[PDB]
Amino acid sequence: MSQFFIRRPVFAWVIAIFIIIFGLLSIPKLPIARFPSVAPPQVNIS
Amino acid sequence: QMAFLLGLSMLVVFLVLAALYESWAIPLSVMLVVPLGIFGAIIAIMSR
Numbered sequence: 001m002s003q004f005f006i007r008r009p010v011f012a013w014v015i016a017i018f019i020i021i022f023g024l025l026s027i028p029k030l031p032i033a034r035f036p037s038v039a040p041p042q043v044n045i046s
Numbered sequence: 047q048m049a050f051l052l053g054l055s056m057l058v059v060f061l062v063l064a065a066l067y068e069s070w071a072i073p074l075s076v077m078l079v080v081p082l083g084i085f086g087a088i089i090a091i092m093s094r
Binding site for chain 1: 057061062068
């Protein structure tokens with residue numbers, strides 16, 4: 001595997017840029033919070 | 047969202063090309079042909 005990329009650096013940089021651009025497109029649409037849905041969900045019947 | 051679909055699609059094709067032919071010039075030469083196809087497409091649409 002590694003020996004394949006030692007002679008094909010452009011392929012390595014292409015996979016790197018693929019990951020980099022997908023992460024940069026993904027970050028904005030990622031919700032933010034102080035904690036995840038960690039506390040058990042409650043259904044209140046008033 | 048017609049610009050991002052053409053901006054992202056073109057970039058995907060460029061990166062795949064560079065991966066496939068281990069170079070940065072070959073994918074540029076392949077990308078340089080897209081405006082000609084769009085050219086005809088626009089020509090046909092305007093004419094019709």
